Amino acid sequence: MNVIAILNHMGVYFKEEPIRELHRALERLNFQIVYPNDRDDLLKLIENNARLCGVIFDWDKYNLELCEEISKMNENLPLYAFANTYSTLDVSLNDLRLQISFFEYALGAAEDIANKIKQTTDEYINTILPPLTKALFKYVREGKYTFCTPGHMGGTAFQKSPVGSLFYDFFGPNTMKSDISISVSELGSLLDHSGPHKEAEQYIARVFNADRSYMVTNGTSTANKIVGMYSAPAGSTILIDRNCHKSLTHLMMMSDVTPIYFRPTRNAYGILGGIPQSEFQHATIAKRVKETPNATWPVHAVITNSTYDGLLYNTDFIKKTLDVKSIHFDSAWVPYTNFSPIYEGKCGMSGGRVEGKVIYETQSTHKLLAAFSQASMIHVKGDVNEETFNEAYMMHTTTSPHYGIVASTETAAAMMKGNAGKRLINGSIERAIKFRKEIKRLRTESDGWFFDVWQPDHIDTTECWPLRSDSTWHGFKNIDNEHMYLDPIKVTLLTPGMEKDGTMSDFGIPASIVAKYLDEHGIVVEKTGPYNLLFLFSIGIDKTKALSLLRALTDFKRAFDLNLRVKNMLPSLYREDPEFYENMRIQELAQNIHKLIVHHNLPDLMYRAFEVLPTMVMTPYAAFQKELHGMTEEVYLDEMVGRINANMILPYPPGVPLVMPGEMITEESRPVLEFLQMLCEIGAHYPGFETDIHGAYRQADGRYTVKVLKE
Amino acid sequence: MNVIAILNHMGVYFKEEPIRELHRALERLNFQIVYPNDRDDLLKLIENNARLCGVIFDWDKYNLELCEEISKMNENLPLYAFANTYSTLDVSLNDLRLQISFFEYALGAAEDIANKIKQTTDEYINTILPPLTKALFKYVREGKYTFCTPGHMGGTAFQKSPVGSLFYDFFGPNTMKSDISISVSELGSLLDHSGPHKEAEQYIARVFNADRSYMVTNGTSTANKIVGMYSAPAGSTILIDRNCHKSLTHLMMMSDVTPIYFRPTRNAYGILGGIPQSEFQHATIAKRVKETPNATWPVHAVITNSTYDGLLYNTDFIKKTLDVKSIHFDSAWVPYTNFSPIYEGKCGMSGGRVEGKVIYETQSTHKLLAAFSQASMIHVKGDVNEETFNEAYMMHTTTSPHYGIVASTETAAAMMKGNAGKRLINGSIERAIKFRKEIKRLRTESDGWFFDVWQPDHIDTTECWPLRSDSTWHGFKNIDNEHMYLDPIKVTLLTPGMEKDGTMSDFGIPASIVAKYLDEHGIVVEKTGPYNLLFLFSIGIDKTKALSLLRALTDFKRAFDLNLRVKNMLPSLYREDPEFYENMRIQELAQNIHKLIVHHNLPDLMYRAFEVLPTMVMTPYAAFQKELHGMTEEVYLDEMVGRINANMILPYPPGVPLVMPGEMITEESRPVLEFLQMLCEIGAHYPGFETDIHGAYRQADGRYTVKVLKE
Amino acid sequence: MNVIAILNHMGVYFKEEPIRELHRALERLNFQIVYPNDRDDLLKLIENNARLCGVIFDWDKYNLELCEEISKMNENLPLYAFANTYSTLDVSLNDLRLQISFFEYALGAAEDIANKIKQTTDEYINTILPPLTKALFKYVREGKYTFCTPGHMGGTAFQKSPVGSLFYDFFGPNTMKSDISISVSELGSLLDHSGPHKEAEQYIARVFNADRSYMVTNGTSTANKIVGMYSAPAGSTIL
Ligand SMILES: Nc1nc2c(ncn2[C@@H]2O[C@H](COP(=O)(O)OP(=O)(O)O)[C@@H](OP(=O)(O)OP(=O)(O)O)[C@H]2O)c(=O)[nH]1
Numbered sequence A, B: 001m002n003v004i005a006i007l008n009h010m011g012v013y014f015k016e017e018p019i020r021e022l023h024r025a026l027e028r029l030n031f032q033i034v035y036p037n038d039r040d041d042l043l044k045l046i047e048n049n050a051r052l053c054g055v056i057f058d059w060d061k062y063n064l065e066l067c068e069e070i071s072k073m074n075e076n077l078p079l080y081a082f083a084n085t086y087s088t089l090d091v092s093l094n095d096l097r098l099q100i101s102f103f104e105y106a107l108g109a110a111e112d113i114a115n116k117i118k119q120t121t122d123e124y125i126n127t128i129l130p131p132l133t134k135a136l137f138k139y140v141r142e143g144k145y146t147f148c149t150p151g152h153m154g155g156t157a158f159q160k161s162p163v164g165s166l167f168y169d170f171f172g173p174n175t176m177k178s179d180i181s182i183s184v185s186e187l188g189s190l191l192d193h194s195g196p197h198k199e200a201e202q203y204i205a206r207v208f209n210a211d212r213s214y215m216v217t218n219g220t221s222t223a224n225k226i227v228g229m230y231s232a233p234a235g236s237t238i239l240i241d242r243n244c245h246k247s248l249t250h251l252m253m254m255s256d257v258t259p260i261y262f263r264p265t266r267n268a269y270g271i272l273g274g275i276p277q278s279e280f281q282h283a284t285i286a287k288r289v290k291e292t293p294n295a296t297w298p299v300h301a302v303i304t305n306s307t308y309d310g311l312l313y314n315t316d317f318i319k320k321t322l323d324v325k326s327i328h329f330d331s332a333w334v335p336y337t338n339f340s341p342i343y344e345g346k347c348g349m350s351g352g353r354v355e356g357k358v359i360y361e362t363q364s365t366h367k368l369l370a371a372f373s374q375a376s377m378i379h380v381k382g383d384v385n386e387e388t389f390n391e392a393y394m395m396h397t398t399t400s401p402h403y404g405i406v407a408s409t410e411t412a413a414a415m416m417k418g419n420a421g422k423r424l425i426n427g428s429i430e431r432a433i434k435f436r437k438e439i440k441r442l443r444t445e446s447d448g449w450f451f452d453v454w455q456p457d458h459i460d461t462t463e464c465w466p467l468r469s470d471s472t473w474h475g476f477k478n479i480d481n482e483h484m485y486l487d488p489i490k491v492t493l494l495t496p497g498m499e500k501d502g503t504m505s506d507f508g509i510p511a512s513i514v515a516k517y518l519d520e521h522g523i524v525v526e527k528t529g530p531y532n533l534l535f536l537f538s539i540g541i542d543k544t545k546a547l548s549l550l551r552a553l554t555d556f557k558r559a560f561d562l563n564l565r566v567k568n569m570l571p572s573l574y575r576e577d578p579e580f581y582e583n584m585r586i587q588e589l590a591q592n593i594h595k596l597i598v599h600h601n602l603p604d605l606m607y608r609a610f611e612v613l614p615t616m617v618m619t620p621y622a623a624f625q626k627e628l629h630g631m632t633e634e635v636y637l638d639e640m641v642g643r644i645n646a647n648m649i650l651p652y653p654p655g656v657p658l659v660m661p662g663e664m665i666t667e668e669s670r671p672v673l674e675f676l677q678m679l680c681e682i683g684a685h686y687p688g689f690e691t692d693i694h695g696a697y698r699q700a701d702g703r704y705t706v707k708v709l710k711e
Numbered sequence C: 001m002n003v004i005a006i007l008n009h010m011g012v013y014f015k016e017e018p019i020r021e022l023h024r025a026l027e028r029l030n031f032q033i034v035y036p037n038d039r040d041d042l043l044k045l046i047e048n049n050a051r052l053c054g055v056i057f058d059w060d061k062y063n064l065e066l067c068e069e070i071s072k073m074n075e076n077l078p079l080y081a082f083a084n085t086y087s088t089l090d091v092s093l094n095d096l097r098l099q100i101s102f103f104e105y106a107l108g109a110a111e112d113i114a115n116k117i118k119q120t121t122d123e124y125i126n127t128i129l130p131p132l133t134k135a136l137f138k139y140v141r142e143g144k145y146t147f148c149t150p151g152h153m154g155g156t157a158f159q160k161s162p163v164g165s166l167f168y169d170f171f172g173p174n175t176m177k178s179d180i181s182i183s184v185s186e187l188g189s190l191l192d193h194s195g196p197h198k199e200a201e202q203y204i205a206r207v208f209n210a211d212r213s214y215m216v217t218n219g220t221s222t223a224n225k226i227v228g229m230y231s232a233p234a235g236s237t238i239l
């Protein structure tokens, strides 16, 4: 934070010379001094440089051209306004939030003015920093405790060791010194929710629209379990999204509960859709309780909102309709929903309290905001028993939390506060929409096939576009209306190969091939299905990254159409098996994999495998207890009908749980087995395109086994 | 790592001028040159500066004076040896580990030699760095993945925000870029135990004497639960140290198990002693199983080794005697035991496999080695079902681990490896012993009272000194021999106030007053009891911190004997309650508090409180289930006899569990209540010396309540 | 390969100052920075100077005027394109072979951008160098074999002799160190057609429109005899 802008040629030495003097005085204080040419140049400087922390200008010349524009960008940004005898305040300024200091033009005043600017810069810094992080930085600057844990004592133990010195030097002093413990009494305590930690939690709850917020330092994996353990006593029944993260399987394995699954929909691409509205109705649930051994009325429900591919629920509908006293939205993918009105009514915290219910979001701050790995938040709307909730929190929280992770969780909130926060989120939405429109444009303009974007036929509006039953784009048959919405920032691209019907085209380019090409060019694909690719247009992704991705896609098409050798176009793939890929061309690879997909009927098998559930013979908890007693064995995948599965089976595609521990494939659920067998067969053909089923094990002879409970 | 030492005046220009040329060439490559005066000056430079990464010298003049001494300090340290025509290799060098390059004295060769030195320095760095940390640092320098989580994208996202830029600037680019995910495929995966992660685990197991080691990123709080949950299925019985960390109480609250408690001893100071040898013998356990409802033969045993105050067990005895197939040493306080022979036979991993048993250590690498907060290791000796063990591991491990914490765990191993590592731990043992001897010396030399050290009458040997039944220093009655040992690095200081009999002295200085004094001077007291203070002489604590502590203790005596005003001697205490402390002097404070301890009979009540056990009415798991159903209420502490406790009650002193959830104080265990009532009374008198009982709540009228289950 | 061209007057400090900063950061990495007046000046600079290895320019201002013309001269030439908020890719670029990195105008970003340019320059060099030559140059920079023929050992033996030192100094270190033998096993072998030598032969064959190519080190005088002796056994007739 050291860049000061000076805006001006004034034509009078009595103004210009004191400004030259101020330039020199500011440089002596280690500011860097920048000179925009005009009003628009200055606004671009502010917009492009977060470290620009002050603006010097002639008041009469510029106030009516600058003040309103600046206030929209940054409420808090120091203005250093130089006054004329008759300078005054226009009524248009009355309601603007501005930080203004007024100065005179005088020779010899520069040193004093520079000192005031320095002081006002520190006040700005202290205004924008949140409380715990501010306290942590101050401690690192000023503090001096010894005989403390961490045993490394601000990195001291590292410096006495050759390898330790490399480690210390890599991370640097501030990182090492900020790794502290509750011995630093002035920072309070995470587990006690005291001092600056209490201030951080209250600060976060305000920013994120929660009644109460908890900082978790072991990821949403852990936040999910804290919420679940508080919410679901032994002997109870819970409703759980079949599209649930593995941490919720772990919760079920650790807690003696009976699950009843919400059943999401899916399209022909293998993309998950929303749990239909009928799944939330009392009659539906009551009947499933009746049909489930040992089930009672659910005390807790867990819903994944949004889906991975960006489908958000009408959460107003869910909260009004779902007659369960505790509703937890696993919101790991959507930590930013409070920061744009486009997400209103589409996130757990939206709106107010619900009578007789507590609502939660868990969020992975590190995924789609800016925070260190393992940073997570629990947001609560409604009443909890605070002591009992804290026991559950403490059961999963270390006694030695990492303060960097904690500070980063609080600073993520600070970043999202106000106009600078709204602008960060708006910008990610705008850039996602810009890129979405570019794909559609290039699809029209290019010669022959192109990528498509999975979205409405027109996106002339900035909103989470509703999925409507009268539109074919989303692929979900007979969808509920006013139920699901597409998050603009979750951009799904489609490769040729499937028709509007959900039927197969003659020409196809399996998305795995495009992903391989992108990885050559350092672009990671978050998620891939047979003909789909997901890109997260997060606040991380700037215009430069968006352009690089767009250019890589036009280059894929250009190179594909030239039919380059695999050896040249996909060197990393070639290196996996040069002899196999020596003479193969890209169009041949695409054709062959596509024909495999078609021949094996993969999309239809994948649809049918997930449309029926395996039978719950025992709960995940009960199955794991069996495993703990050594009562598992391996059988060939082919032999698993009528056996109780020990491990979750999670195939890619489509990357969601297929079989839970304690479930059995029966005749009712035979397509589960056939899908798994097909994945094993199709994966045996192309090096680099191997079968990937978590819970299935390739044997030396190329058959797969799975782990089942002993009879 | 950029300091190169040149050792010499040779008296011939043909040698001196090329070395002048090399000095310049090396400065151009950004090395610092240093010029020791002689052999001993060079060795001190190496001893004091881990970043000294090369030594240049005339081979004939120095090799017989340097090579052996250097090899004893650093096996790997590059030597750049300048040879004469007749230079040869002495037979004494044959078995030394040395890294030597031979060079000639020639004008114009310096640029080439300097380039070879640069290359050799990089090889040295690559030799000493462990595999995962090396890969991480290399990725940071060279990698270029975009469209990646963490969403901050090497800190990118922070730089677009004013407050974010401050956070980025504080931690720095390396810290930000090293926060990565499994998208960086060349680093493999923690959860899959693959690539450099697998290399890290094997490297660690080798360094720490384990068959298998796991890196945990949520502290030993979590490592304890991973081991416990693998080891103790629902319905089972476990043997658990009554001196158990809260994480083990949480384990019992989360797992449907029945505890039987090992019963530690204690002394009149309130310092915990070891579980007696009789507690481990078959007939003792069999009888307890018979007397405990629902108990069966224990499948798993948990022992805290060492105690907080440094008492280590004869673990050879435990392993031979304890007829339980799974024995877990919670070794959070002693992660360094594999690095000095003084700990052989006194730690979990010591020795070889135990037939028919699996042995664990869990260790908080961040407490007494050098690693980031939350870094923990599980060490296994014996067979586990690797796949079931991994499920329990994954159940408590995030899907987005913090790679800094992971790299710090592996680097802690790299630091402890070999001669560098033996020297580090030897150093800390030597310093602890030096300081112990200094207290004994000052006690003799000083005028009137002084501190004492809780240790044997003679410590003229470097070992973990055995506690003997024929010695009275440790205060334990009828102790088993060849059973408990005192770790040199855990230094307990005693303040005046108790006689050798365990009776009270007329003159006392409660240790709490000394702790408040030390805290004024930025010295943290790890643990305090009525008349004891614990200091950890970790590899953090250098000679400078040891002298600062010794001086602070002499200053405490000096200022105490002058009888300074509390206002002047303890200003932070004074500003607690200025009006209360306005005229009080230090000796009066010490006297008054000591008289209170004496009047209330605190040591006798504390001893008796912990010698009986509350009655286990239900297991902690069953008690927590009741709390989860809302079935708790608050009663006054005075009315708790015959009530089932909902919370753990943990009083300070002596800082170990007194009552577990599910336990009830009866007439048989009334001393528990008497002790707690006394702590409440004694704590009402002096601001800053308040009652501290976890599980008891001070009401506005000064009465205390506890949480119990509803009748 | 160390000349970088910057093309421009933009009229806004928010763009010009970051480019000034980038100038300085690049000179610190030992690049030389040239400033063409306009599009045609830049194209002449590229045409006349093979060691011009990168071009920095404002994307919007120049992409439609530069990208096709550059792709006609050099497929592989690094372009460092500075983007505006609304910068996009014209359909006319689709089939051009371009190497483009996109950057933002920001104060204090120059050190990072200059390092990325350095990296891209090394990637460009490694793209255009063929496999054996690239391996040879890397060995000279990095290798350390001893007890090696040629007996001169990277020119070492020459430096011990007054006349030898003159010979070494004339040809220079790279020439002397690149005179190696099959002892440098990572370069494979000409006679075995192995390793980078096999890659060189296949590279050559493709460039020259051959099924197979052989590298001969004793002139076409010798290449003629190799072909001839394989082709014409004793007692045969040749045209
Ligand atoms: N403190 C302060 N606030 C002002 C001022 N002028 C406008 N505001 C706005 O008012 C908010 C404080 O509103 P209050 O009514 O005082 O607080 P409350 O909403 O928590 O009850 C600030 O929100 P915020 O918490 O700063 O964050 P955000 O909502 O702007 O992101 C800020 O947006 C001012 O002069 N001082």
Ligand SMILES: Nc1nc2c(ncn2[C@@H]2O[C@H](COP(=O)(O)OP(=O)(O)O)[C@@H](OP(=O)(O)OP(=O)(O)O)[C@H]2O)c(=O)[nH]1
Pocket (backbone or CB within 6 Å): B097, B206, B416, B417, B418, B419
């Ligand atoms: N690589 C290598 N090792 C040598 C050499 N000379 C002695 N050593 C020592 O030998 C150890 C390796 O012993 P091995 O028999 O190869 O491996 P093992 O102990 O794992 O079976 C090294 O231990 P370490 O794992 O490096 O650590 P530490 O035991 O010294 O702490 C090091 O102490 C050598 O020339 N090269």
